[PDB]
Amino acid sequence: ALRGTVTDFSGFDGRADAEVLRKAMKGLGTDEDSILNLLTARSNAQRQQIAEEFKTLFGRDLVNDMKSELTGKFEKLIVALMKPSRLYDAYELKHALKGAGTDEKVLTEIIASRTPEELRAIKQAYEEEYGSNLEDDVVGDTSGYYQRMLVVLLQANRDPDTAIDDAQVELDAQALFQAGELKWGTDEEKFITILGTRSVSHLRRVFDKYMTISGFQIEETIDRETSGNLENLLLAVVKSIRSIPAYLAETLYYAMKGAGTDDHTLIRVIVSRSEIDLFNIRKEFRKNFATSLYSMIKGDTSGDYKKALLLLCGGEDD
Template structure:
């Protein structure tokens, strides 16, 4: 969903060997040169960073992740390690962590599975299997229950229609089905909601939501807020928001992570790293529009030190 790829301006004269040597020099001796590491990683694309990792291992017989783990700490370490991951590996690790041990972090499952395109979900399932030698679908099934489980498993099938054609008749039929399944029935018929929300294309869903409002006089969000609760409500709303405007959804999530007391650094890292080569440019524009200040300025006022510099390097 919402994956217009905007490639940022990266090094034209890219040399993985030069960059590997720069990082090596920044980590050797007394004291670490954090700024150099940030600059090298932030000025390269995800693909180029994979090459730097390989070259580092070839040159020094060491795993670059391990080196950064030993030399850095806290949020800066988390940010730079996240930048070294391929997106599917990063998502796989986050999903695994959300389900490990006692208790499940449903918010992470909802954010990652409700906002990703089919190809991203397929790649993440493969990465998950390679890293943790278990099946992502099975893990999600055993860690969630009820409607939420059914919804997430449906999303993991990664068979959402991604076509660009809108069928107005279908939109009207779906709008009626949603009405029959929601407002018009005692207890919501979640199967209908799940099927429509996880299988239809973004454009088709937008037409359906419009038809719903025309036919029944209330927005799909209002209906979901009335009919669903807890994590299911959150998941439905995430899909609806992402369908309507994925960049606004992430702008709002970033804003919430910095609002009030204490900044949720892991949310900032997660969104800025995972959207950096997808739609971060548009997210910045949405942020500016929605909150009348730039994302960079907000990051400056809510974070500090090298962690701040790393996030700003991503946002720039």
Template sequence: MATLNVPPVPPSPRDDAIALYTAFKGFGCDTGVVINILAHRDATQRAYIQHEFRTMYSTDLLKRLSSELSGKLETAVLLWMHDPAGRDALILRQCLTAENLEATTEVLCSRTSSQLQYLRQVYHSKFGVYLEHEIERYASGDHKKMLLAYLTIPRSEGPEVNREIAEMDAKVLYKAGEKRLGTDEKTFVQIFSERSAAHLTAVDHYYNSMYGHSLKKAVKKETSGNFALSLLTILQFSANPAKYFAKMLRKAMKGLGTDDTRLIRVIVTRAEIDLQHIKAEYLKKYKKTLNDAVHSETSGHYRAFLLLLLGPNQ
């Protein structure tokens, strides 16, 4: 469930474009007006506003926002202005060129099969290169094999599970990992890339009942590095997407300093999807509202923008 709060009768894109242009005029930008408009418009409305702004003022709204805003607020707002697939493509481009394979893994392994198929098309049309070729270039070893398989192999997204196959997969994974000396990584890649989220959750259930501990624990024992990270991301996202992202947000804000890049990425990409559920999981797991956590870790207009995307403190 999304947290985005759109007015029942939002102003026309033309009125919004005029209001934004007015906020930019004069000495300094009326940042409060800018974020109040943009944080209350969905992806379609934001696209219409950009179109109207270009038509009326012969300039790109994103370029204007970039010149008027700065720092973390600029990063968050510019990311927000894209549609979901275009935003994911941009995030991946930035992560891959910076060789940030942890963030690349987070994004790729926490998207549905249909989202990934569309993302591949958008990435190619935006940047003129295939996402698969970028992964070939920047990733390596079993991690690369896992990302490429997960990106390209279609998977069911329904709740249906064949219990016999799920039980068999649990046995196969045990034989490929804990039962033998060394790990048969190819088997892990095959099962994790070909099976649906519901199916992997069932495999985890059978693994636990047959071998006395979770598949997650087995993955941690048998694999390492970015390969382990990709398997664990797929497993955790399959079981409970909201809980997975609650953990990512906690990781962004825990300890000394805040990982603002991760914080922005999760809030902005999930606000129109399931941020309400993520907030509920965050409260349940950490006994603190996500709004309160974000409030204590951020400041100024940047804080105000993220809190608008988060919706009421609950």
């Protein structure tokens, strides 16, 4: 079953919480410990409630006050923690599309790992919040098959899980084989239709059969046949089909990979999944990397930032 690491706090008193926060910031300096200890122990819904209580009591904006009092990565984490759950993905996508450049990894990460219901919710929130259509903006900042696959995924029309059809599994596996390894070049359109619209249960069967037929895992063929953002997107899609938790766990691993850390990604994953499947992510993480996610973060981060991340993540055993 899917499980997160953050849940509603029992005996929740938003008014009292707003007072704690006001006390942590009022006056010289800031009580960062008090702030993180509280917010990481409250669900996203409760945080929004605290924000309204804070404003009702003081006429001050909670998030604006924390941005004034805080700084660095700790601030970025607190700000993300404050973003309403329903708007967070839309927010990160908007951030990925701002300016002339484009943050492809974010578009790929979110669009490949969100369910059709989540994408429908995101598309709506995005347009309501920014006054523009998500698909349109994505199309505007992307090109080629990478763009097309993203558009297919944005339609949020992946087939639901229905009775498994053996002939169909064989048919699709063989089709991918002819579209890639057996073709001079690649029939990208076939990979996009099959990997982007077929059901999760169907594709899991297809991946197994594909290996049996070709001798290659679908991930290997993808690397052999494609490159650029298309390659990254197809891998993310395949990995999410196998296991969203596993994909995100791997996403975290390569974010604390080597000199320095990809904090933007580290924060987004921890925050976005904290109330969905961060627990599952932890398990898949421990199994695949022989170390708990906790240890990874602990040795890659520091300060209040580190403290907050560790409280949200949890599972120091694992």
